[PDB]
Structures are given as C-alpha cells and as structure tokens.
C-alpha cells in the first residue's frame, strides 16, 4: 500500500497550486478520501473530504468555496486545487483513506505529505495535558473531552485516536473509542463514556513517544485535539 | 467389498442404548430450562427488538 | 429401511413359461411407480416394464411387448411379472427396481450402476 | 459373498432387536402433559431484493447482524440485515452454486457448487477488497455442502457419496468420509465441534467422528432421499427433512427413532430444516412455496411463513433467536420475527 | 434524518452496488442459456466442436449478434435426479441422439421420456438432434439391419405421403428415418400440455447448418414466451 | 323516456366498479411485474375513475344540482381518454411483441412500460385543463375561435387512437398468417376480433357522438337524443368489460 504525495513548495500570496497524490497497491476507486492539514507546529486539522464515486463532497468551512477536490479512478490519483492562497495556508498536507461499510476501521493509512509555504456549530474536542514525562515501564493514561456527547443513537461512540512519531506521520490506534486497530500492540487500550474519553497504555516502551490526538466523526466537519507530547 | 459392511456392523452392533424415557426427560428439561431466551417462542418487547 | 427382494425366478428351456414376484417392505406400496429391469450377461442394466400406482398405466421394451405382462397387488405389497414363450435372449438377472420420489410420474435413473432402492435380482436362464 | 450377505442380515436383525428392546415408551406419550405453544405468528420484518437468479443457500453471521447469500447468476451478497445494506457483492468464476458458509471469526466466506471445488474468499483483506484466497479440489462430483470450524479446517459433503476435512493452508483432504452408496445433500457439527451428522440419497443419515475419520453411528428411518439436515441445541439429537414429506428426530444416544412430524395435507418435499434457540419450535421449508413452524415435542403444526411465490430453498434461525431468515426461488429473501 | 456521517457513506456504497448489479442485470438478460444431453455413443461432442475432475464444461457462439452458452456435465455421477434440478431457467435443452444403432434405441427413448416429463423441466422445449444419418442411410441400403427385430410394429408402417421432402434419396431410407422421428414425436406428444415443443432434426457429421437451426428454434421459443405472456396461446 | 338505460348503467358501473377494485388488489404490488400487468393495473386504475364519476352523476340525475355535474365532468372525461389511450398502447405492445420477438425479450428496458403509462396520464389532463381554459373562463371562448379548434384536435386524437389500434391488430394478424404452421390460432384470431369489436363499438361511439353532435347545430329530433344514452351505456360496457377480458381470461 502507498500513498504518495506530490507539490508544494513556496507560493507568494494570492497564486495558486494543485496537489496530487497517487495511491498505488490498492483499490482506489472504493474508499473515500480525505486531505488534512497540519500547521508548522500546531495540530492537525482537517481538510477537504470526497466519497467513492465522486458523488458527496465537503470542504472545511476556513477554505470552503476556495478550494477543490477531484480524483480520478482510472489513472489512479487524487487532486486538490487551491487558489488565492492567504498566509494561514502555509502547512503539511496529508491525505488520507477511508472505506465505510459495517465494521470498517476509516482512516486506515495515511500518506506522507507535502509542505507548502508563502511568503460556531463545530463540536471543540479539549486535550489539557500537553506534556506526559514518563519512564519506560509505567501505565499511562490521556484524556480527551468533547463538547457535545459523542455517543449516536444505534451505539457507536465515534472517537478515534491517533499517534504521530517524531518525524513521522500519523496512524490509526483507536477507532469508535474501544476497538483496536490492526497492526497495533495489544497494550493499547481505550475507554470512557461520552464526553470524556481515556488512552491507556500498559508497558510503556521505545517506538511510543510521540504526540496523541483524539479525533470525532459524528458530523463534519472533523474536528481534532491538541495534542499530548510524551516524552521520556 | 462386502466384507468393510460386514466389519463396520460388527463395530457398530456393540454400542450401549439408553432407554427413550430418558431421551424424552432430558429433551424436555432442555426445553423448560431455556424457554425464556428465544424471541421468537416468547416475543420480546417492541422496545428491544431491533428488526 | 426399504428392501426388495424377486425370489420367483428359475430354470426353464425355451418355450416355457415363469412367474417373477418381489416382496416390498419398509414404505407406503400405494405411491410409487414400480419397474421391472434386466441386466444380461455382458451388457449392461436396461428397462424391460412399466407399471403405474394403481395400474392404469402400463408400458413395455418392444422386445417383450406381446409376451410379458406386469401387474401389482397393493393390499399385499407384492409386485408380479408373468412371462411366458421364453426366448434365448431372456437369459438374465432381473431386478425390482423402484422409484425414487411418490406421487410423481417421472422417476430418474431406475437403471443405474449403483441404485439405492432396487433390489438384489434373480437370475433365469433358458437352455 | 456366499455367505456375507447372510451375517450382514443376521447382524441386522440383532441391531434392530436391540433397538426395539430400549424403546418403553414413546415421546408422543411422554410429552402429552406439556401446554402447547398455540399459535406462533410471524411478520415479514425485512425484504431483502438483488438477486437475479433463484436463490440455493444462505448462512447467518456468527454476530447476528451479517448474512451471506448464494444466487445461480454467480453472485455472493453479504447484507447487513438491520438496515438493508449490501455490505460486499462478490463474483463468482462458476455460477452453478449450491452452497455458501460464513466463518465463525468472520474473516473467510466459502461456496461451492456444480465445478466440484470448494472456493474460500478472505473478506478482511488489505486493498478493500474479496479475493479468492484458496481453491480446494479433489472431489469427483458436484459440492452439497460446506462448513467452517476454524479458520483453517472445513469439512465439505459431495455427491460423490462422500465427506471431506480439508486443511486450507496447505489445502488437501486431511480425511476422507465413505460410506455413503448416493449423493450427500447435507451435514450439521456438533455445538463442541468434534462430531457431525450427514444425510444422503439413499435414505440414510449417518453420525461420524472428526479426528478419527469413523462412522460412529447409521440411522435409517426414512424411505426416500434426504434434503436437509440440523443438530438439535443441545448436541444430542437431530432432525431431518426428506422428499417423503415428512420431518424426523433421531437420538443420538438412544439410537433410534423419537418423532415423526408430517400431514396428509403435505405431499411436497422438505428443502431446509433449522431449530429454534431452545430447541421448541422446528423450521422446515417446503416445495409448495411456503415454510412452516412445528412444536419439536408435541409434533402439531403452530406457523405458517407464507410469503414466497416459488420454491423456498435456504432457511435459518439466528444465534441468539432475533429474527429467521428464509430464501427461495424467486430471488427475494425475507427476514421474519 | 437521524442517520450518521458514517451510515450515510454505508448507505451509497450499497447504492453504488445496487447500480453494479443492474448492469450485471442486463448482461444476464442479453445471452442465452442451453443445455447440451446425450450419450456417448451420440457424437455429441462433434457437435460441441462444430460451433468454432471439472464438474461441468461450458462453450460460447454467437449467432446473429446474439449470444449462447451451451453447457455439458463431464465428471458427475449417472444419477442426475439432483443435478438437473439447477436447469429449469434454461432456454432450451439440446437433445443427440445416435439413430444408426437399433441396440440402443430403446434407452435414447426412455431418456428423452424421462427428461420430457420432468416437474422441474416441464417448460423448458427439447430440441432434438437426430444424429448420424449417414450412418444410418447406409446400414439400411446395405441390408442386414432388420429393424422390425427391435420395434415390433414396423412391419405394418408407411411413409406420410402428405410431407415427405427429400432431395433425390432411396425411399427405404425416408420410412426408417420418419419412423424413427415419429416414435419421438409420439413420446413428445403423449404428454405435452402445451407449454413447450419438440423441435426433432436431422443431422450428419459434417453438417455445418447446425448453428442457425438453434437459433430458430429459439427464436421461435421466444416468441411463444410472449405471446403466453399477453395471453394469445 | 328512458330511465331503464340509466338503470342498466348504474348495474354495469357498479359490476365494473368491483370487477377493477378485485383486480386492483389482486394485481396491487406482486403476482406480476411484465408490462402487461403494469398497463393492466393502470388501465383498471383508469377506469375505477371513470366508473366511479359515471356511478355518481347516474344517481345525480335521479333526484340530485348542476354544481357538482360540473365538478364530475372533468375527472369523468380525463379518465376517459385515460383509458382509450390504455387500450391503444396495450394493443400497439402486442404487436410489437409478436413483430420482434427478441427484442420484447432480450433488449428492452424494464420500466419503459411504467415511463410510457405516466405519460399518457399526464398528456390526459393537458387536454382537461385545456379544456376548462380554452373554453371556459380564460378567453369566454364558448364558441366564437378557440373551442372549436379544441374539439378538432379531440376528434382527431380519437381518430388516431382508433387508427393506431386497428392497424396494430391487422399487422400482427397479417404477419401470424403469413408465418408457420403448426399453432392453434384460433385463440389468437378470437381474442384479436374481440377486442378489436369491443373496444370500437363500446368506446369510440360516446366521445365521437359527444364531441360531434355538441357542434353540429342541426339537433332537432327526440331520436336524435337516444343515441346520447346508448352510447353512455355502451361506454360503461367498454369500461366494466375492459378488465374482466385481459385479467380472467389471463389468470383463469
Ligand atoms: C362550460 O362548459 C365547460 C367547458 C369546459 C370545461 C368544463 C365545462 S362545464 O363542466 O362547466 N360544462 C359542462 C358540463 C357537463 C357537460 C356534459 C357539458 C358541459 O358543457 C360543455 C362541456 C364541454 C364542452 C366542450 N368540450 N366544447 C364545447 C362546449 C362544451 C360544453
């Protein structure tokens, strides 16, 4: 599986550029795509959103009307093309899959981006610890808080988390709060009821410093954390 | 042929039978026990239901 | 379980006359359509008689058809073939074939290598 | 032969002298002081439409949610039986299928048919999509029958008069089950999974054993072919459905025949048999389109589901007795409670 | 709409395969589906080959720009009482006969009998392929085939004089082959009902019109379909 | 006077009235999805209307005011042509079905039938509310230039309806007797001349009469106004026989 992104670069205000990104090793034409941001050294924020089958789109509401997304099935490759680029723009962009289906874990695997530079309703997720010195060999626990209740009617509690290394970028942990995703140590583990929501890890180790965000996905758009620098 | 029949009646024709009393008594003390977990003997309540 | 057996059937030179008969036993005798079947030296199984539920119907090989004449007795579950003026080529295995599935009239496959309900045969030779 | 034939009879008699002799009283009896169950209506609850073709077999999810059909256009459909949702559609590369099974983890789907292979689909796969992961051959006549036990073991049932327990990572026959003189229509494991019974053409079930590859016990009571085949919830009877219009229960450990359940009504064949979660009420489709409920220990017809225009094929009660789902011909399955 | 961001998405993926399936719909309905029978001494399988452990063998031809699969059992049992059940949405059933050999008249009768007055192929329309008749012409001309040896009830049998088309061929052959072709149509005919027909041919080896024939007759099977439909027949 | 014609009427609305409400139900979401059925459902439809409004004005014209005749006229005659437009695309469907066997089968798409029906519906009201407008209020055009036109273009939509369907019916009866042998046909031919009869002397005499004598200025006679309760009657025939032919002669 690979997902690699091309463009960026500097831009001087008020220009425009185009963005690709050529999944290869996969199935492209039945997952839904994302395109997430991230700013210098802030967190993540999401982007632009586009379905399988091109027939459901949505912007986030800082670039809505401004931006475009479009993929292409056949040669195999994912566009966004952005005009009158302000100074807020300047950021890290990541895209990002998603397949949708009864039991599916959305946001599987994440690309590695791209750096471009120049020259109300939404539901706000608070991440307070934003520094956790601990040792190898503790149990530790993160704790995320949202605004409304995250927990539907049919049961699910949409929360998803997520770990991004030092120089690396991020994957899938937790996804709708409780199940593990694939490929992960069983030693992670998450819990909480709607509005509070905890990360627990058990035998801390190497390969686990990094920073955590907690993510919903009741409604868009996207909403992300602020993130919780482990360190040793 | 005729003789792999002729063996396998012999293994099966020794075999210890209980009677059908006890048949019948351990299928109907199965069917009194859980007879208070299937909807679809006893109906369950609207408000359960998911169909 | 179901069983057939055509003990009826013995030595006779040619001009004479035989009687197969077949005890049923193990099934309703009133909802199928019995056969009568014949496997001669060398070749394999062929059909040589017909004979409905309650007997309306009735169908013959061409080769037996002014000779041979099937009939049937349901109160006592028996199942009769006279056959009369024996040729030299009646020499044979003959065998109470049922049919697979009641109250139908076709029935597949009364004449294959290995059939399940069909009985275990008698064997007439005329010399 | 001289003489085989008349040991085998003579040891035929035993058997069926020494069943007689363990047969007191009768379930009819036994159960009379029982309050029937009256009468057991069910709705249509769900309609579940795709299909092109007729429809000739479905399996329940292990979580009660999921379920997998087989059509004879080519088509496997998994549904999402709350919302009516096709979760995955996949092609086949043979469209004369009889057979489909859901794996108890979920991972692995399998369906044979008239090709004679066994073909298993691994669901949760990278690249977001169901591909063939194996194709077990070895059968000399078409696929019947199919069941999971682990991941990696499937025993397969053919018309070939024989069973096969396959291993799917190396995939070849671990063991071969014979004994069978016509075509095998169905089996059903054991709730522990270490036997299973197995219904054939020649009017004859038979209980066997897994590990070892024996043929522990034979019941024959019926006297046409055998359609359909279940394992009672507690382990220890099954019920089986023949083109003689009738339905029958067998006893594991008493060895012999307990009930008949039939009507003079009734003249079609049987085609599906499945149990309730308490082992009270015993489904059975049926030839002359429409299924029927029967109280499993008083033998009175307490339902009808009747909601099908043509031949019903596949039936199925759920793990936990939510709802039953029923297939037939006409390309429509329905999801009753 | 009391529905998730997430149900929504589950929602038209399903609808993208709805879509999917109705053009695997009209694809299934565009081609036609027949079912090749016949012994092994029938010649079947020149007639296989003359359209240009597997348990089944499947071939395609197209003819007029429309499409036939014509499927043969090859590795089953011969008990076919459980295996024919999965034919009866076929459009018609190729039927070979070998007619040159008296030996086994009887059982290609009994056979086209016994597939006539099946329950699940009651609607389903026979086409029968009278093979070998050269073979048969020959061993009549020749001598020494006496057929009243087998079928008793040809000594007292004449040639239909109203239809009897044959260019320039002895007229001992054309009563073996009418004879022949009216045991058939006898057994076709006895019990019909009226919902699907005997289309009986005659074949040799190197035939090359074999290919049009099952187009008519299917066409001609067609339009009985709809004329049963707006109740006409 | 002729008051057992309208008694007649009301027996022959009432037997159509059940006939098309039995048929409604029995053929209302299953038994049958082929474009027979779906324009046998919608011509039923067609006519439960027209049977209901001609009921409902035969027991006005008893006792009971010229308001409510006013209110049943246009639903009367909407589902009038409704129906005849019906009949003709039922017949045209035939015909195309026997002239090109494989393409009614094969290449042909699943809901036209459907597609075709709601068309014809709504072509149907066009011309009502043309009639109300065109004639009645918008231009006071009672006859003076443009109600005149109007009724030309309804006699000569009937014309064409009745043309449409008997060369429908002569094209297939030709072509099944130019082909083979070896048919019962005399099912084909009966059902063919009965319909054909039925449907023009039971439908077009009503609307050719109305939509003719209402303009032609030379209606002085009292056997000049037995022809309007004949030709009523023969209607409420056409309407209540149109089910029972199709439908129980199919599902017998
Ligand atoms: C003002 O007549 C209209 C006109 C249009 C729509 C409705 C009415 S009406 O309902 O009000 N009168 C009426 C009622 C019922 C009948 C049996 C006759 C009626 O008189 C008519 C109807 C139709 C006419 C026609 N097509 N051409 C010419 C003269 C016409 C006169």
Same mark, same amino acid.
């Given at each position: 599986v690979?997902?690699?992104?091309?463009?960026?670069?500097?831009?001087?205000?008020?220009?425009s550029?185009?963005?690709?990104?050529?999944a290869?090793?996969?199935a492209?034409?039945?997952?839904?795509?994302?395109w997430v941001?991230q700013?210098?050294?802030?967190?993540?924020e999401?982007?632009?959103?586009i379905?399988?089958?091109?027939?459901?789109?949505?912007?986030?509401?800082?670039?809505?009307?401004?931006?475009?997304?479009?993929?292409?099935?056949?040669?195999?490759?994912?566009?966004?093309?952005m005009?009158?680029?302000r100074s807020?723009?300047?950021?890290?962009?990541?895209?990002?899959r998603?397949?949708?289906?009864?039991?599916?874990?959305?946001?599987?695997?994440?690309?590695?981006?791209? *750096?471009?530079?120049?020259?109300?309703?939404?539901?706000?997720?608070?991440?307070?610890t934003?520094?956790?010195p601990?040792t190898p060999?503790?149990?530790?626990s993160?704790?995320?808080r949202?605004?409304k209740?995250?927990?539907?009617?049919?049961?699910?509690?949409?929360?998803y988390?997520?770990?991004?290394?030092?120089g690396?970028?991020?994957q899938?942990?937790?996804?709708?709060?409780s199940?593990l995703?694939?490929?992960?140590?069983?030693?992670?583990?998450?819990?909480?009821?709607? *509005?509070?929501?905890?990360?627990?890890i058990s035998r801390?180790?190497?390969?686990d410093?990094?920073?955590?965000?907690?993510?919903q996905?009741?409604?868009?758009?996207?909403?992300?954390?602020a993130?919780?620098?482990?360190?040793? | 042929?005729?003789?792999?029949?002729?063996?396998?009646?012999?293994?099966?024709?020794?075999?210890?039978?209980?009677?059908?009393s006890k048949?019948?008594?351990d299928?109907?003390?199965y069917?009194?026990?859980?007879?208070?977990?299937?909807?679809?003997?006893?109906?369950?309540?609207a408000?359960?239901?998911?169909? | 379980?179901?069983?057939?057996q055509?003990?009826?059937?013995?030595?006779?030179?040619?001009?004479?006359?035989?009687?197969?008969?077949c005890?049923?036993?193990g099934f309703?005798?009133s909802?199928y359509k019995?056969?009568?079947?014949?496997?001669?030296p060398?070749?394999?199984l062929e059909?040589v008689?017909?004979?409905?539920?309650?007997?309306?119907?009735?169908?013959?090989?061409?080769?037996?058809?002014?000779?041979?004449?099937?009939?049937?007795d349901?109160?006592?579950?028996?199942?009769?073939?006279?056959?009369?003026s024996?040729?030299?080529e009646?020499?044979?295995?003959?065998?109470?074939?049922?049919?697979?599935?009641?109250?139908?009239?076709?029935?597949?496959?009364?004449?294959?290598?290995?059939?399940?309900?069909?009985?275990?045969g008698?064997?007439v030779t005329?010399? | 032969l001289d003489?085989?034939r008349?040991?085998?009879?003579?040891?035929?008699?035993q058997?069926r002298?020494?069943?007689?002799?363990?047969?007191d009283?009768?379930?009819?009896?036994?159960?009379?002081?029982?309050?029937?169950?009256?009468?057991?209506?069910?709705?249509?609850?769900?309609?579940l439409?795709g299909?092109?073709?007729?429809?000739?077999a479905?399996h329940?999810?292990?979580?009660?949610?999921?379920?997998?059909?087989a059509?004879?256009?080519?088509?496997?459909?998994?549904?999402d039986?709350?919302?009516?949702?096709?979760?995955?559609?996949?092609?086949?590369?043979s469209?004369?299928?009889?057979?489909?099974?859901?794996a108890?983890?979920?991972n692995?789907?399998?369906?044979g048919?008239?090709?004679?292979?066994?073909?298993?689909?691994?669901?949760?796969?990278?690249?977001?999509?169901?591909?063939?992961?194996?194709?077990?051959?070895?059968?000399?006549?078409?696929?019947?029958?199919?069941?999971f036990l682990?991941?990696?073991?499937?025993?397969?049932?053919?018309?070939?008069?024989?069973?096969?327990?396959?291993?799917?990572?190396?995939?070849?026959?671990?063991?071969?089950f014979?004994?069978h003189?016509?075509?095998?229509?169905?089996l059903?494991?054991?709730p522990?999974?270490?036997?299973?019974?197995?219904?054939?053409?020649?009017?004859?079930?038979?209980?066997?054993d897994?590990?070892?590859?024996?043929?522990?016990?034979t019941?024959?009571?019926?006297?046409?072919d055998?359609?359909?085949i279940?394992?009672?919830?507690?382990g220890?009877?099954?019920?089986?459905?023949?083109?003689?219009?009738?339905?029958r229960?067998?006893?594991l450990?008493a060895?012999?025949?307990?009930?008949?359940?039939?009507?003079?009504?009734?003249?079609?064949?049987?085609?599906?048999?499945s149990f309730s979660k308490?082992?009270?009420?015993?489904?059975?489709?049926?030839?002359?389109?429409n299924?029927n409920?029967?109280?499993?220990?008083?033998?009175?017809?307490?339902?009808?589901?009747?909601?099908?225009?043509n031949?019903?094929?596949?039936?199925?009660v759920?793990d936990?007795?939510?709802?039953?789902a029923?297939?037939?011909?006409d390309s429509?399955?329905?999801?009753?409670? | 709409?009391?529905?998730?961001?997430?149900?929504?998405?589950?929602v038209?993926?399903?609808?993208?395969?709805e879509?999917?399936?109705?053009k695997?719909?009209?694809?299934?309905?565009?081609?036609?589906?027949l079912?090749?029978?016949?012994?092994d001494?029938?010649?079947?399988?020149?007639?296989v080959?003359?359209?240009?452990t597997?348990?089944?063998?499947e071939?395609?031809?197209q003819?007029?720009k429309?499409?036939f699969h014509?499927?043969?059992?090859?590795?089953?049992?011969?008990?076919?009482?459980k295996?024919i059940?999965?034919?009866?949405?076929?459009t018609?059933?190729?039927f070979?006969?070998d007619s040159?050999?008296?030996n086994?008249?009887?059982?290609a009768?009994?056979?086209?009998?016994?597939?006539?007055?099946?329950?699940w192929?009651?609607?389903?329309?026979?086409?029968?392929?009278?093979?070998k008749?050269?073979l048969?012409?020959?061993?009549?001309?020749?001598?020494?085939?006496?057929?009243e040896?087998?079928?008793?009830?040809?000594?007292?049998?004449?040639?239909?004089?109203?239809?009897?088309?044959?260019?320039?061929?002895?007229?001992?052959?054309?009563?073996?082959?009418?004879?022949?072709r009216?045991?058939?149509?006898?057994?076709?005919?006895?019990?019909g009902?009226?919902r699907?027909?005997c289309?009986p041919?005659?074949?040799?080896?190197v035939?090359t019109?074999?290919?049009?024939?099952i187009?008519?007759d299917?066409?001609?099977?067609?339009?009985?379909?709809?004329?049963?439909?707006?109740?006409?027949? | 006077?002729?008051?057992?014609?309208?008694?007649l009427t009301?027996?022959?609305?009432?037997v159509?009235?059940?006939?098309?409400?039995?048929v409604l139900?029995?053929?209302?979401?299953?038994?049958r999805?082929?474009?027979?059925?779906?324009?046998?459902?919608?011509?039923?439809a067609?006519?439960?209307?027209?049977?209901?409004g001609?009921?409902?004005?035969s027991?006005?014209?008893?006792?009971?005011?010229?308001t409510?005749s006013?209110?049943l006229?246009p639903?009367?005659?909407?589902?009038?042509f409704?129906?005849?437009s019906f009949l003709?695309?039922?017949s045209?469907e035939?015909?195309?079905?026997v002239?090109?066997?494989?393409?009614?089968?094969?290449?042909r798409?699943?809901?036209?039938?459907?597609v075709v029906?709601?068309?014809?519906?709504?072509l149907?009201?066009?011309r009502?509310?043309?009639?109300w407008?065109?004639?009645?209020?918008?231009?006071?055009g009672?006859?003076?230039?443009?109600?005149?036109?109007?009724?030309?273009?309804?006699?000569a939509?009937?014309?064409?309806?009745?043309?449409?369907?008997?060369?429908?019916?002569?094209?297939?009866?030709?072509?099944?007797?130019?082909?083979?042998?070896?048919?019962?046909?005399?099912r084909?031919?009966?059902?063919?001349?009965?319909?054909?009869?039925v449907?023009?002397?039971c439908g077009?005499?009503?609307?050719?009469?109305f939509?003719?004598?209402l303009?032609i200025?030379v209606?002085?006679?009292?056997?000049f106004?037995?022809?309007?309760?004949?030709?009523?009657?023969?209607?409420?025939?056409?309407?209540?026989a149109?089910?029972?032919i199709?439908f129980?002669?199919?599902?017998?």
């Open positions: 690979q997902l690699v992104e091309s463009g960026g670069g500097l831009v001087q205000p008020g220009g550029r185009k963005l690709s990104c050529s290869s090793g996969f492209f034409s039945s997952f839904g795509m994302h941001r700013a210098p050294e802030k967190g993540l999401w982007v632009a959103y379905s399988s089958g091109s027939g459901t789109i949505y912007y986030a509401d800082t670039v809505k009307g401004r931006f475009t997304i479009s993929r292409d099935d056949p040669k195999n490759t994912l566009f966004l093309q005009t009158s680029l807020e723009d300047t950021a890290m962009y990541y895209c990002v998603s397949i949708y289906y009864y039991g599916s874990s959305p946001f599987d695997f994440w690309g590695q981006g791209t *750096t471009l530079t120049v020259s109300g309703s939404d539901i706000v997720m608070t991440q307070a934003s520094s956790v601990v060999g503790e149990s530790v993160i704790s995320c949202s605004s209740s995250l927990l539907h009617s049919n049961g699910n509690t949409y929360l988390w997520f770990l991004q290394r030092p690396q970028s991020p899938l942990l937790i996804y709708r709060m199940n995703a694939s490929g992960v140590p069983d030693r992670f583990s998450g819990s909480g009821s709607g *509005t509070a929501f905890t990360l627990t801390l180790e190497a390969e410093v990094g920073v955590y965000y907690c993510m996905h009741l409604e868009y758009p996207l909403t992300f954390g993130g919780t620098k482990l360190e040793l | 042929q005729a003789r792999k029949l002729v063996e396998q009646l012999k293994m099966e024709a020794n075999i210890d039978r209980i009677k059908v048949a019948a008594a299928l109907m003390a069917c009194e026990a859980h007879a208070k977990e299937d909807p679809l003997l006893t109906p369950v309540p408000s359960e239901n998911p169909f | 379980q179901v069983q057939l055509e003990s009826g059937g013995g030595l006779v030179q040619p001009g004479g006359s035989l009687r197969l008969s005890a049923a036993s309703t005798f909802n019995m056969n009568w079947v014949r496997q001669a060398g070749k394999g059909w008689s017909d004979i409905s539920q309650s007997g309306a119907s009735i169908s013959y090989t061409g080769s037996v058809k002014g000779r041979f004449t099937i009939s049937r349901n109160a006592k579950n028996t199942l009769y073939l006279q056959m009369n024996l040729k030299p009646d020499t044979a295995v003959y065998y109470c074939a049922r049919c697979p599935a009641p109250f139908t009239r076709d029935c597949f496959d009364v004449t294959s290598t290995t059939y399940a309900y069909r009985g275990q008698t064997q005329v010399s | 003489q085989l008349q040991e085998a009879e003579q040891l035929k008699n058997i002298d020494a069943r007689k002799a363990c047969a009283a009768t379930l009819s009896q036994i159960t009379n002081n029982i309050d029937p169950v009256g009468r057991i209506q069910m709705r249509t609850r769900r309609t439409r299909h092109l073709a007729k429809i000739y479905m329940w999810g292990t979580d009660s949610r999921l379920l997998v059909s059509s004879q256009d080519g088509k496997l459909i998994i549904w039986s709350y919302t009516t949702n096709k979760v995955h559609a996949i092609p086949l590369r469209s004369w299928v009889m057979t489909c099974a859901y108890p983890s979920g692995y789907v399998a369906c048919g008239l090709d004679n292979i066994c073909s298993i689909y691994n669901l949760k796969t990278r690249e977001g999509n169901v591909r063939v992961s194996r194709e077990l051959a070895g059968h000399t006549g078409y696929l019947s029958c199919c069941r682990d991941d990696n073991q499937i025993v397969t049932s053919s018309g070939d008069t024989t069973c096969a327990l396959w291993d799917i990572e190396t995939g070849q026959q671990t063991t071969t014979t004994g003189t016509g075509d095998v229509m169905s059903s494991l054991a522990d999974t270490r036997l299973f019974v197995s219904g054939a053409c020649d009017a004859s079930a038979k209980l066997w897994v590990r070892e590859g024996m043929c522990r016990q019941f024959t009571g019926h006297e046409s055998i359609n359909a279940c394992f009672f919830p507690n220890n009877a099954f019920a089986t459905g023949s083109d003689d219009a009738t339905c229960l067998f006893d450990r060895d012999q025949e307990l009930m008949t359940y039939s009507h003079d009504n009734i003249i079609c064949g049987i085609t599906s048999v308490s082992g009270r009420l015993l489904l059975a489709g049926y030839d002359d389109f299924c409920v029967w109280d499993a220990l008083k033998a009175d017809r307490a339902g009808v589901l009747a909601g099908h225009d031949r019903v094929s596949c039936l199925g759920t936990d007795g939510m709802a039953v029923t297939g037939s011909w429509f399955l329905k999801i009753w409670n | 709409c009391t529905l998730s961001a997430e149900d929504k998405a589950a038209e993926r399903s609808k993208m395969i879509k999917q399936l109705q695997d719909k009209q694809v299934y309905r565009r081609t036609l589906r079912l090749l029978l016949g012994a001494n029938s010649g079947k399988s020149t007639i080959k003359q359209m240009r597997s348990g089944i063998f071939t395609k031809f003819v007029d429309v499409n014509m499927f043969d059992v090859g590795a089953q049992r011969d008990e076919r009482r295996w059940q999965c034919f009866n949405d076929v018609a059933i190729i070979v006969v040159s050999d008296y086994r008249l009887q059982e009768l009994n056979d086209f009998k016994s597939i006539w007055n099946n329950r192929l009651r609607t389903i329309s026979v086409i029968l392929f009278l093979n008749q050269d048969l012409a020959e061993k009549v001309l020749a001598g020494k085939s006496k057929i040896d087998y079928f008793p009830e040809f000594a007292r049998y004449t040639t239909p004089e109203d239809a009897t088309p044959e260019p320039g061929e002895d007229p001992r052959v054309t009563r073996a082959k009418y004879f022949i009216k045991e058939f149509v006898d057994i076709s005919t006895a019990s009902d009226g699907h027909i289309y041919h005659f074949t040799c080896s035939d019109e074999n290919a049009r024939r187009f008519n299917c066409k001609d099977i067609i339009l009985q379909m709809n004329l049963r439909e707006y109740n006409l027949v | 006077q002729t008051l057992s014609l309208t008694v009301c027996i022959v609305s009432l159509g009235l059940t006939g098309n409400a039995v139900w029995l053929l209302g979401c299953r038994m999805r082929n474009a027979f059925s779906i324009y046998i459902l919608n011509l039923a067609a006519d439960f209307l027209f049977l209901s001609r009921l409902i004005y027991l006005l014209s008893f006792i009971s005011p010229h409510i006013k209110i006229y639903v009367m005659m909407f589902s009038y409704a129906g005849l003709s695309a039922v045209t035939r015909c195309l079905s002239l090109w066997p494989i393409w009614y089968r094969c290449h798409p699943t809901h036209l039938s459907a029906c709601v068309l014809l519906w709504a149907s009201l066009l009502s509310i043309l009639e407008m065109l004639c009645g209020f918008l231009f006071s009672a006859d003076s230039a443009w109600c005149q036109t109007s009724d030309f273009i309804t006699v939509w009937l014309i064409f309806l009745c043309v449409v369907l008997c060369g429908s019916s002569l094209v297939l009866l030709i072509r099944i007797l130019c082909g083979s042998r070896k048919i019962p046909l005399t084909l031919y009966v059902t063919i001349l009965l319909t054909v009869l449907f023009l002397l077009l005499p009503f609307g050719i009469q939509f003719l004598f303009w200025h209606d002085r006679e009292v056997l106004c037995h022809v309007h309760l004949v030709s009523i009657f023969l209607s409420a025939l056409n309407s209540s149109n089910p029972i199709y129980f002669v199919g599902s017998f």
